[PDB]
Amino acid sequence: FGLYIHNDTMQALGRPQDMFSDTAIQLQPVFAQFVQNIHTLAPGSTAPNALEPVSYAFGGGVVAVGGKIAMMPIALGTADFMIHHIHAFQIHVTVLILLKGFLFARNSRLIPDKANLGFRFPCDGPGRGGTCQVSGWDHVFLGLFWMFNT
C-alpha cells in the first residue's frame, strides 16, 4: 500500500518517470506468464487424445459468436502484481485475527480463566487498564469486517 501511495504522490508531483507500470519503473509477474504459456500448447503431447486447450483465456484463438465476445486470452501486465499482493495481504491479516482468537481462546498471558468463564461475554472489568473485547466472537467480528473488505 505504501508503494501504491508513493506512486500516487509521484503522479501528483510532476515526476511521472517514477511511476511503476510498463511505461515506467518495471516489475513483471513472470511466473503466471510462464505457467499460462506451458498451459497454452498442452494438447498433442500432454493431451494427445484432446483437440483444443481447456480454456481460451490462457491460449488459443479468440472464441466468439456474433458481435459479442465469448472468451479471449487475458493479459497480465504490471497492475496485476500489487492487486494479487494486497489480496494475499488481507487474507493474511484475516487469518491473523481468526487464528489469534483460536489459539488465545482458553488462556491468555493475562486472562487465565477464559475457557473457565465462557466465550460469549463482554469484558472483565477495567483491570489492567481496559479489557473490553477479549472474547473470541469479537475476534470474528473484526475478521468479518476484514473479509468484507477482501
Q: Which residues bind other proteins (CB under 8 A)?
A: 38, 41-42, 44-46
Which residues, 21 to 80, sit near ligand CLA by CB under 6 A? 46-50
Q: Is 149 one of the annotated binding-site residues? A: no
| Residues paired with residue 47 on neighbouring β-strands, in sequence order | 43
> Of 18, 123, 137, 150, which one interacts with ligand SF4 (CB under 6 A)?
123
Stretch that binds ligand SF4, among 24-32, 67-75, 120-128, 137-145 (CB under 6 A): 120-128
Measured between alpha carbons, how far is 137 from 150 in angstroms, rounded to an integer? 19
What count of Cα atoms within 13 Å lies in the side-chain half-sphere of residue 48?
1
Q: Where are the beta strands (DSSP E) in 34-124?
A: 63-65, 68-71
Q: Which is nearer to ligand SF4, 2 or 125 (CB)?
A: 125
Task: Give the total of residues touching ligand SF4 (CB under 6 A).
Answer: 6
Residue 81 CB-density burial (10 A; 0-12 exposed, 13-18 middle, 19+ buried): middle
| Contacting residues toward ligand CLA, per CB under 6 A | 46-50
